[PDB]
């Protein structure tokens, strides 16, 4: 009659498929924001889909909020198209009415379904309003719990503007730099449910459906299928849905679960060190491109390969292989985003690292490319050069090109001004700061 994941919802936090450390680290935080004069204004939970975030919040607000109620959860409804109110004001009205939940009223807030953040205006409104909540001058506020499901937005009609929410729906691409780095903000990233918890809970669902399971003689096989489901996915709801589909069926239907997306560093490691259980490089790269073309079709991926190919055996491999890798990357850079470029580059990197991979290798740790740092440094240089050029006209009539500023006037003119400073003009230090090594 009802879905298995809906009729088998845990009744207590002992029944929830969560790690012990995760439960402790969410309970301690939730108590921390509950006490008056709490340091943490809001709590942000982030992770994949169906990692039992909402469930633990339900039970924790069930056995925590009553303790601090003086003499439940309140969720935002984006579907509430109320009369006389624009859509962008719905969250404003909700937050204004939900802040009146302090005295004689206590209800933890769960923002499970966010407002539409793909529209830039209302996304910015969301940022500004949650910042106003964070920086609020109110004496105290009810605790704010926001759950974000990290999912990759797949490709669609070729028009992408935000560049953050248009490639990945995550807390980093929704919330800005100020919001996440805040003393009063607490963030607990979640992890997929491990195979042990999945196996135990699927066994519990089976031992609660023995008659039907025994009716269709599928109980002599349930253990292998439970292990297979636990190994395939880290999603509790999807695992239970697949188990229900298998149990209620009467045939030899293959057990198929939703495919989980591959992260950035996951893809980098798969390109560098290969993938276990797939000794075919061709098929692994093919599946990587079909499933994660959004991540692989970018300049950031080639930059990551260039930055992290030296982490194979702590740079202890032949220079010929490194030259081949960088040569192929440079050739791929001359194809302007054609699919053949990415395919050839990744295939060549994988082949090069396969021909040199053996046993006894101790690899390093990959890192994100530092290109954004160089862009910020170049922007600071541009600002300083503009300032120097501005000073270099009204003080004395002279127009100098920017190339000369980068070449000679960024070093010789500050040197002259420093000598003039010692035997005595605004710009006395070197442009872009000193160089080292």
């Amino acid at each position: 009659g009802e879905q298995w994941y809906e009729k088998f919802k845990p009744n207590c936090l002992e029944q929830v498929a969560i790690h012990k450390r995760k439960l402790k680290d969410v309970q301690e935080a939730l108590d921390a924001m509950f006490l008056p004069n709490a340091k943490h204004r809001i709590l942000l939970l982030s992770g994949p889909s169906g990692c039992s975030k909402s469930t633990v919040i339900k039970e924790l607000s069930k056995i925590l909020v009553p303790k601090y109620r003086q003499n439940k959860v309140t969720e935002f409804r984006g579907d509430c198209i109320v009369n006389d109110l624009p859509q962008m004001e719905s969250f404003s009205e909700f937050l204004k009415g939900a802040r009146y939940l302090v005295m004689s009223n206590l209800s933890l807030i769960l923002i499970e379904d966010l407002p539409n953040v793909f529209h830039i205006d209302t996304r910015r409104r969301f940022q500004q309003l949650i910042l106003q909540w964070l920086y609020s001058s109110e004496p105290l506020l009810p605790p704010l719990v926001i759950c974000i499901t990290e999912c990759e937005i797949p490709e669609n009609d070729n028009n992408y503007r935000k560049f953050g929410i248009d490639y990945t729906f995550s807390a980093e691409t929704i919330m800005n730099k100020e919001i996440l780095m805040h003393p009063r903000l607490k963030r607990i990233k979640f992890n997929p449910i491990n195979s042990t918890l999945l196996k135990k809970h699927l066994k519990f669902i089976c031992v609660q459906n023995m008659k039907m399971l025994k009716e269709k003689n599928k109980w002599n096989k349930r253990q292998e299928v439970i292990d297979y489901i636990a190994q395939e996915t880290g999603d509790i709801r999807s695992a239970i849905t697949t188990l229900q589909f298998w149990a209620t069926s009467s045939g030899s239907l293959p057990i198929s679960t939703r495919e989980s997306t591959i992260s950035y560093f996951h893809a980098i490691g798969k390109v560098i060190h290969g993938s276990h259980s797939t000794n075919n490089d061709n098929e692994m790269i093919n599946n990587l491109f079909e499933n994660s073309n959004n991540l692989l079709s970018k300049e950031d991926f080639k930059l990551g390969i260039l930055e992290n190919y030296n982490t194979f055996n702590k740079g202890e491999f032949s220079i010929s292989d490194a030259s081949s890798i960088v040569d192929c990357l440079s050739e791929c850079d001359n194809m302007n985003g054609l699919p053949e470029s990415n395919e050839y580059g990744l295939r060549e990197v994988r082949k090069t690292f396969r021909n040199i991979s053996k046993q006894g290798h101790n690899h390093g740790t990959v890192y994100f490319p530092r290109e954004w740092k160089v862009r910020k440094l170049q922007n600071s240089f541009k600002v300083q050069a503009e300032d120097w050029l501005n000073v270099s006209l009204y003080k004395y009539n002279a127009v100098h090109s920017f190339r000369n500023i980068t070449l000679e006037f960024g070093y010789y003119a500050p040197l002259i001004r420093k000598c003039q400073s010692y035997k005595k003009i605004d710009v006395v230090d070197r442009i872009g700061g000193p160089i080292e090594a």
């Binding site: 300049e299 490194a322 006209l393 009539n397 002279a398 127009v399 090109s401």
Partner: protein, 346 residues
């Protein structure tokens, strides 16, 4: 003011390093009415801009050197605000379209087609020149607007664009301009200019050899040599000796240190350190083309390398310079060049 600007020749008769080019400029400026479109090409720092300004003074008289700077706003396809600085004097205009990136086409269209159609009648009609510094940095889309702009509206505007190594300039633009070659001064002329500068500046000079040293170290760069002269003048209490060190820019020293490291230690970790150095160089907005050029010509000055290694280095440098021309990210090609060099040296 710097000694490069303090002693800039303000007249066609005040240029005293090429002579024959000055005679050609005077021949051009004898009858300004039929002046064609000009393209000044020559090594960096030889004095092309000074020659353009001297020709403009010869035509329009003194007053071309009264530069007024104003910021004019643009709008792109995505409707972002861009601010180009237009150094404007009477009788001529200065524009550096490279101040914007690939978005210089909208400048070359809006700003230049505005003045091309706008006549200069005040019953008498004059043609106002427009100077385009760094004509190489145009992106083959600004030049395509440029060609018809100056072909059809020649009656009202004249184009004088300065550049070095005019190979990235398209054939339609080159065919539409008078090609003026500006060679770099010899060491004797640089030394003579420096002698005049020190004489007018009351710097105590031990011997004249230390001016030939400046001229040789600047590699035919008048501005670079004058900046070195001022640097050692203000770092030696206005008294220069043969012990006064030849000072070179910091990035040149960094590139030479990188060359020494590349020749000495050749491993993947050395490659990573070289990548860090290259990223530091790029953080100082030093263009990757000149980074590769200086790296190549410092690696060809190492005496421990035989002819085979040097030939391999120059071949790889040419290949990766062509790659850098057609590329989008410089670090790929810089790292590839360094890796190829480190793989060929051993």
């Amino acid at each position: 003011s710097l000694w490069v600007d303090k002693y800039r020749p303000k007249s066609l008769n005040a240029l005293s390093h090429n002579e024959e080019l000055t005679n050609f400029l005077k021949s051009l400026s004898d009858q300004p009415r039929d002046l064609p479109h000009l393209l000044l090409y020559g090594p960096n720092g030889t004095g092309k801009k000074t020659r353009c300004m001297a020709l403009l003074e010869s035509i329009f008289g003194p007053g071309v050197y009264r530069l007024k700077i104003d910021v004019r706003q643009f709008v792109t396809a995505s409707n972002r605000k861009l601010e180009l600085n237009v150094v404007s004097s009477p009788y001529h205009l200065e524009i550096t379209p490279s101040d914007m990136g690939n978005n210089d086409r909208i400048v070359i269209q809006e700003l230049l087609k505005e003045v091309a159609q706008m006549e200069q009648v005040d019953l008498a009609h004059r043609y106002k020149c427009v100077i385009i510094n760094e004509a190489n940095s145009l992106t083959k889309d600004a030049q395509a607007a440029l060609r018809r702009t100056m072909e059809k509206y020649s009656k009202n505007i004249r184009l004088i664009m300065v550049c070095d190594s005019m190979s990235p300039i398209i054939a339609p633009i080159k065919s539409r301009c008078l090609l003026i070659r500006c060679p770099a001064p010899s060491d004797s002329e640089i030394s003579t200019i420096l002698s005049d500068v020190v004489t007018n500046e009351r710097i105590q000079l031990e011997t004249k050899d230390i001016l030939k040293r400046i001229a040789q170290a600047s590699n035919g760069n008048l501005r670079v040599s004058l900046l070195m002269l001022e640097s050692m003048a203000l770092n030696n209490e206005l008294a220069l000796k043969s012990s006064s060190p030849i000072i070179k820019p910091d990035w040149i020293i960094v590139i030479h240190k990188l060359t020494r490291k590349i020749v000495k230690e050749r491993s993947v970790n050395s490659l990573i350190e070289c990548r860090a150095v290259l990223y530091d160089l790029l953080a100082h907005c030093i263009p990757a083309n000149i980074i590769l050029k200086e790296l190549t010509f410092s690696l060809l000055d190492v005496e421990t390398l035989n002819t085979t290694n040097k030939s391999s280095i120059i071949e790889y440098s040419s290949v990766f310079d062509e790659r850098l021309s057609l590329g989008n990210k410089a670090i790929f090609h810089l790292e590839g060049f360094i890796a190829k060099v480190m793989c060929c040296l051993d």
